[PDB]
Amino acid sequence: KSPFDLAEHFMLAQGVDINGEAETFAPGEINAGAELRSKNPLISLFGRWGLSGKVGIGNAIPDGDNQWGM
RNA sequence: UUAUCGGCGAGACCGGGAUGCACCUCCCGAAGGGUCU
């Protein structure tokens, strides 16, 4: 069985702290959670609630004027 | 970039019928001939 529980699973999947147990980083300190960032590279790349994610995924913009259809 | 985070998703046959065919001559004329054991 997967070691992750509902709380950890949702933290890693969608960054919602369901159990209310998460490191409440200071609001003004930008580089907060370096320990968490190192320990959990997933929560580092994509953020959790209260920790800015590191991965910025832009939109897929078409390169033409007629490239969509019904 | 006035913060921190979030796939919108899952299922579907669009198919079922039809003859396009029915009528027309393309023909009308001509010498290719003459020079060298």
Side-chain angles (χ1 to χ4, degrees):
Chain A
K1 297 171 74 172
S2 280
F4 305 127
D5 60 358
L6 197 72
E8 289 142 25
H9 170 79
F10 261 64
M11 200 40 25
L12 267 65
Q14 309 183 327
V16 191
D17 191 41
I18 76 190
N19 68 340
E21 206 287 328
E23 275 65 7
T24 309
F25 303 121
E29 208 289 335
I30 301 303
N31 276 348
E35 201 165 16
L36 199 146
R37 293 250 175 85
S38 303
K39 285 159 68 63
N40 198 318
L42 195 141
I43 300 298
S44 174
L45 281 165
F46 319 95
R48 53 170 276 286
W49 171 233
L51 181 67
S52 63
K54 268 184 184 167
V55 180
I57 302 296
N59 322 77
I61 310 304
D63 301 352
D65 190 24
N66 205 334
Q67 258 174 342
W68 53 97
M70 285 329 322

